[PDB]
């Protein structure tokens, strides 16, 4: 499983539209559910929103220059659906499409392959007003949007990702209400999860109809579950958390079914129509895998919707998010996914870490982020050397940005953003990543 | 046979002088046999000629910049003998030599290693008027020209190629008359083949006399032969086609003899003088291998000079040239050459494909050329992983150019040339090649 | 030993402060022992000195541009102790610190990792006036200087080297008197060797106290010894020369003891205080290995301090220094060092060769330097493929420079320096090294 001649590996960085673009009410853009959600008192730390963010809508040439300087071969970005179709379905916003044309063409001029993500959580509010992902029609609206983007951009862009982290859009957005649109209802979360996955499948078929050379995948985040206890009920807690976070989304895509143990525990029906599971399980060219941390759980008969709770394990390394740092879990997750779901290949579409950064003498020295990055790259390559088909790695993120309900206080960039001036300052982790790209 | 530490691989692009330079009657250049041949009604499609071509004589800085942008480490180009010695033998044209000085120095400033080919078919007409390659003296004229080029440029240029594709210069130029100088006579083709190969050997010795650190090879195109029939006579047809196309030129270089079955079938004498076969078979640092397609043949008792004919096999993928696409033959050819001729190392000095390209919105999306390139690189690395010493790959061609008797209608570039404006437009295949160079 | 996914390799070039900087009495710099030594007639060939050298203090941006052009990932340089602390201990010289800040920041802007060496022989004369390395306090002065440099620069610089080639500073500087400070006394050489090594250990501990992520090593030159004789006394000569050159410095660092056979043969006491050997042998992240040549010796009962003499072996290839070229010794040395001393990893911090160069038509063609470089890189990778953990290679040197007692007459650069104009001219070896960096 050692390197052989001709083998390739792609190095990238990742962002998303609402987190960096700004220009939220400029260039014809319509509001997203995160514009609305960010206006709710208490929804986002410090009352932050994405109105300006990193002003990447105006500063994209600088950010593209930083990518070329890093030496990445690829740039994972998302298209803001409400920027290009403000009404969700209907007329294209030519000014919005022109922005992505300039972004794409600028990347290609610099030798960077853009990897578009079609849905990274910024659903048009116009479609939320019709029920959003609770409405089955939203899967079809998404597929039509996806087709239009492929028709516009696939002459240049050959590697597509449909949706990003349906776990967050479905469960965090519709069951726990801590992400847009902020709904708290199990049935709604179930419906949303099915329509996100159906949208993925319909969009995949729509993209392939544009051209047979195009590649398509989905990005799923996986959160491996462990328990500190030995009781059978604590082992059940691990099984339930794994089903809720991981198998609920992986099983439809790769096995054409929902995990029966979770379906039974929910006691609700997934709104599956004829043809849905064939569409959701349509073959993919790759899995986009997001990994950051493992969760520690224990049984809790009182917890809902499933009888387990999170545990904060003692004496473990944690990031500024409070997330456990455990790179060995990354290796084991990659091996598990390859055996369980057998994706043709895997791209790490996100991995990274957030820490308290300080600017000293105009510079940012972030050794904790360097250490996380080094150890997780090592863990990834450990899996690749065992035969897991990992074809590339995208660092989350190129720049500090709007970290959803945490706002701007949580910095994931390898490049620092001073939001007072929009100055970009490469951190120590940027120089480390630059070296790794060149010298591997 | 996997990668080991220290192993190297060279990525390049290839062109030739008459096909790109233009400035055919500028800078003191004298006419070549292709200037003459292109003036004959019916000799070249659409009446095309190389008077202007890609105007690389003036635009070489842009083309070198495109090479740096692609990331190639090497540039295979040819020196126009009639630009540097218009009378074929005698005085150097200082203006022509200064052009190659500027080209070479510009490549080196950009980190690109130029690989000069001394003869890529543009014999000075002054020498054709004395018999060209039919005249034994032409081997010596070529060797003197080669010595002068090494004396001028080998302070910088360490890797030389003498001649390119003697199959074309000898048989297509002097037996079939479809390439310059347009002669149609078997004995003349035999004489030309021997004097091309003798010129190669004399030039190799002359270059090594300039400096012992210099490396020298020859570029041969090989066209593997198959048959769809099972008869013994169709198997004989394969042997005859292989002998005519491949062994006629490979056997003198690597085995110091002409293939006896073809000599006997011709019924003519090769004009071999004392010392010739030792000179032709002088040890080489590498073979430059050109590969594009395999030929399908069958026996034909009426055919001349040998009793076989070409067959257009049914239901196979073909390029815009009508050439079969069969990358597995590339792997098998590389393995066979390594066993049969055992060159110290192999450089793919040409491989590529031509398709009808369309400019849409100022861009050129050429998925069929991308696919050919991907599959032939895969096939080449398959041979390298079996132990074949392939040390580099040069894509034919950087830019669309004058495709000999096909004229400009046949486009081999990974960069499109709009001949009305001389604009260069990178095709999808350019972005693919750029990625492969970086990420392998 | 199987190249695997994730393995890295660092390509660099090396210089040192006194050899390139110039500006010896500018920018607040205080004199070093080499400023003083170079003023003594007969100490340096042609009366050369480092007053101007390559004027890199003023031309560093040009030199950094040349490094970026070569494509190196790393730049090994030394900090001039008397430029940053002119009195050796005490006040920092802000102008000197600012120079290294600009150098470091310029390298990082270009994607180059600076590798600082803290002591490359330019001891402040103010400290020599107090006994220099003969004075135990010099080990502590060095450690305090090292701590201040890490405090200033380790926000950016993570890989440190303490001292370079104590063989030269101790034996050539204090026993043979052919390098600064020009002393000729065995006991002084022994004292100096101990305080250099103690300084290394104290500085390593001081650097690690600044930040636990910092890496530290030492650079040792090793000169493998052979004999042409078969007698038992000539085999003893090999053991003595190996002990004098190599084990005297390697054994303290990696085995916490001085080689007992050499201690006995000297018959002198090393000024070891309790605790010193634990300090000297403090664990290192890597060994910086310098290799240029092997020595041939024979027994000589009359020789001092040890009964052997150098032999000039007949009929071997030699550089312009008179040094034997024998790349196989490099492979065997790397294997031996890894087996006997087991450094966690090895960086080749210096290897290279000097030849008489000639400028012809504004260019420098140096095939003998190319050949040495090619063969020693091959020999290094042979050791890596046997499992030796060689993580990078730094060519000595980026530019021609002041070759100590040989002056400017001995040119080690892959880039030529015309000292009349300070023009930099890349040699053939620069283009070769550029290719190796890209294509390996
Ligand atoms: O939480 C960090 C990172 N993980 C997942 C999301 O895709 C991304 O937008 C977010 O910023
Ligand atoms: O036919 C394509 C290509 N192959 C052979 C020749 O070397 C080159 O000049 C030509 O353009
Ligand atoms: O002698 C060549 C080279 N060897 C070792 C020294 O570190 C360096 O300064 C010197 O120039």
Domain ranges of chain B: 1-440
Contact call for residues C123 and C132 (beta carbons, < 8 A): yes
Instruction: Give the burial class of C129: count Cβ atoms within 10 A of its Cβ; 0-12 exposed, 13-18 middle, 19 or more buried.
Output: exposed
DSSP sequence for B293-334: --EEEEE-TT-SSSSEEEE--SS--B-TTS-B--HHHHHHHH
Question: Minimum-distance ligand to the CA of B19?
Answer: 2
> In what helix (H) or strand (E) does residue B393 lie, and over which residues does it extend?
strand B390-396
Token digits for A340? 């369980």
- How far is Cα C81 from Cα C126, in angstroms, rounded to an integer? 11
> Which residues contact residue A37 at a Cβ distance below 8 angstroms, ignoring those fewer than 6 apart?
A43, A44, A179, A180, A181, A182
Phi, psi values for residue A431, rounded to 5°: -65, -35
Name every chain A residue with its beta carbon within 8 A of the beta carbon of C10. 435, 439
Name every chain C residue with its beta carbon within 8 A of the beta carbon of B108. 431
| Residue of the CA atom closest to atom 11 of ligand 3 | C403
Nearest to B155 among C365, C377, C434 (CB): C365
Residue of B nearest to C368 (CA): B213
Ramachandran area for residue C148 (φ above 0: left; ψ -120 to 50: alpha; else beta): alpha
- Residue B117, number of CB atoms within 10 A of its CB: 25
Q: Name the residue of C170, C321, C396, C408 whose CB sits within 8 Å of the most ligand 3 atoms, as the mutation to test its pocket.
A: C396
Token digits for A243? 């089903």
- How far is Cα A119 from Cα A78, in angstroms, rounded to an integer? 7
Phi, psi values for residue A300, rounded to 5°: -150, 100
Among the atoms of ligand 1, which is closest to the Cα of residue A219? 7
Helix (H, G, I), strand (E, B) or coil at C296: strand
- How far is Cα B248 from Cα C439, in angstroms, rounded to an integer? 35
Instruction: Give the burial class of A71: count Cβ atoms within 10 A of its Cβ; 0-12 exposed, 13-18 middle, 19 or more buried.
Output: middle
A390-396 and A415-418 strand pairing: unpaired
- How far is Cα A414 from Cα A397, in angstroms, rounded to an integer? 6
Query: Closest by alpha carbon to C357, among C420, C291, C406, C428?
Result: C428
- With both helix axes pointing from N to C terminus, report the angle between B428-439 and B56-70 in degrees, rounded to the nearest 10: 50
Token digits for A172? 């965090």
> Which residues contact residue C85 at a Cβ distance below 8 angstroms, ignoring those fewer than 6 apart?
C91, C92, C93, C124, C145, C148
> In what helix (H) or strand (E) does residue B426 lie, and over which residues does it extend?
strand B423-426
Name every chain A residue with its beta carbon within 8 A of the beta carbon of B3. 2-5
Chain C interface mutation, best of A4, A367, A377, A437, highest count of C Cβ atoms under 10 Å: A367
Nearest to B8 among C9, C384, C439 (CB): C439
Name every chain A residue with its beta carbon within 8 A of the beta carbon of C4. 2-3, 381, 385
Name every chain A residue with its beta carbon within 8 A of the beta carbon of C211. 367
Q: Which residues of B touch A (CB under 8 A)?
A: 2-3, 9, 69, 71, 360-361, 363, 365, 367, 370-371, 377-378, 380-382, 384-385, 428, 431, 434-436, 438-440
> In what helix (H) or strand (E) does residue B395 lie, and over which residues does it extend?
strand B390-396
Among the atoms of ligand 3, which is closest to the Cα of residue C292? 4
Strand partners, B91: none
- How far is Cα B172 from Cα B180, in angstroms, rounded to an integer? 8
**Catalytic center residues of B:** 165, 350
> Which residues contact residue A42 at a Cβ distance below 8 angstroms, ignoring those fewer than 6 apart?
none
| Contact between chains at B73 and C9 (C-beta distance less than 8 A) | no
Strand partners, A309: A298
| Contact between chains at A384 and C213 (C-beta distance less than 8 A) | no
Contact call for residues A166 and A222 (beta carbons, < 8 A): no
Measured over the CA atoms of residue C428, residue C432, residue C438 and residue C439, the dihedral's sign is positive
Phi, psi values for residue A128, rounded to 5°: -60, -35
Q: Which residues of C touch A (CB under 8 A)?
A: 2-11, 73, 108, 111, 113, 155-156, 158, 211, 213
Q: Name the residue of B50, B396, B405, B413 whose CB sits within 8 Å of the most ligand 2 atoms, as the mutation to test its pocket.
A: B396
Query: Closest by alpha carbon to B71, among A107, C435, C3, A11?
Result: C435
This entry's atomic model was obtained through X-ray
Among the atoms of ligand 2, which is closest to the Cα of residue B19? 9
> Which residues contact residue A336 at a Cβ distance below 8 angstroms, ignoring those fewer than 6 apart?
A224
Phi, psi values for residue B113, rounded to 5°: -90, 115
Contact call for residues B306 and B237 (beta carbons, < 8 A): no
Catalytic residue among A21, A324, A350, A403: A350
Tokens 């390395």, residue located:
C133
List ligand 1's pocket residues with C-beta within 6 A. A 16, 19, 164-165, 290, 350, 396, 403, 412
User: Using omega within 30 degrees of 0 as the cis cutoff, is the peptide bond preceding C181 cis?
Assistant: yes
Chain C interface mutation, best of B5, B73, B436, highest count of C Cβ atoms under 10 Å: B5
| Contact between chains at B377 and A10 (C-beta distance less than 8 A) | no
**Catalytic center residues of C:** 165, 350
Written out in words, the top-level CATH class of the domain with range C1-440 is alpha beta
- Residue A409, number of CB atoms within 10 A of its CB: 13
Query: Closest by alpha carbon to A296, among A278, A280, A314?
Result: A314
Tokens 């150019």, residue located:
B401
Ramachandran area for residue C90 (φ above 0: left; ψ -120 to 50: alpha; else beta): left
């Amino acid at each position: 499983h050692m390197k052989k001649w001709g083998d390739m590996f792609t190095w990238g960085v990742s962002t998303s539209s609402y987190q960096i673009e700004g220009a939220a009410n400029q260039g014809g853009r319509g509001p997203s559910i995160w514009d609305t959600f960010s206006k709710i008192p208490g929804a986002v730390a410090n009352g932050d929103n994405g109105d300006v963010a990193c002003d990447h809508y105006h500063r994209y040439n600088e950010d593209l220059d930083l990518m070329k300087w890093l030496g990445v071969g690829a740039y994972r970005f998302s298209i803001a659906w409400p920027r290009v179709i403000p009404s969700g379905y209907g007329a294209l916003n030519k000014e919005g499409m022109d922005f992505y044309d300039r972004l794409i063409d600028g990347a290609l001029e610099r030798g960077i392959t853009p990897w578009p993500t079609l849905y990274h959580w910024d659903l048009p509010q116009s479609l939320q007003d019709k029920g959003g992902w609770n409405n089955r029609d939203c899967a079809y609206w998404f597929a039509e949007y996806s087709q239009k983007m492929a028709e516009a951009f696939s002459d240049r862009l050959k590697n597509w990702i449909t949706i990003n982290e349906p776990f967050c859009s479905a469960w965090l957005g519709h069951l726990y209400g801590v992400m847009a649109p902020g709904i708290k209802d199990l049935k709604t979360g179930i419906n949303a999860s099915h329509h996100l996955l159906l949208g993925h499948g319909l969009a995949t078929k729509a993209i392939r109809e544009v051209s047979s050379e195009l590649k398509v995948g989905i990005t799923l985040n996986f959160t491996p579950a462990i328990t500190l206890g030995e009781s059978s009920e604590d082992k059940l807690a691990v099984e339930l958390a794994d089903g809720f976070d991981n198998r609920w989304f992986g099983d439809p895509v790769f096995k054409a079914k929902y995990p029966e143990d979770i379906v039974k525990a929910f006691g609700k029906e997934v709104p599956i129509h004829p043809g849905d599971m064939e569409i959701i399980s349509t073959p993919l060219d790759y899995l986009g895998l997001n990994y950051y941390f493992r969760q520690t759980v224990e049984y809790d008969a009182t917890a809902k919707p499933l009888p387990y709770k999170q545990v904060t394990a003692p004496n473990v390394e944690r990031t500024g998010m409070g997330w456990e740092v455990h790179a060995q879990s990354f290796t084991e997750l990659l091996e598990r996914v390859s055996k369980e779901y057998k994706p043709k290949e895997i791209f790490i579409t996100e991995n990274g870490s957030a820490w308290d950064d300080e600017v000293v003498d105009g510079k940012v020295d972030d050794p904790n982020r360097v250490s996380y990055l080094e150890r997780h790259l090592d863990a990834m390559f450990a899996a690749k050397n065992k035969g897991v088909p990992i074809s590339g790695y995208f660092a989350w993120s190129l720049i500090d940005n709007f970290e959803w309900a945490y706002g701007y206080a949580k910095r994931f960039g390898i490049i620092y953003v001073d939001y007072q001036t929009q100055k970009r300052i490469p951190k120590s982790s940027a120089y480390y990543y630059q070296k790794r790209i060149k010298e591997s």
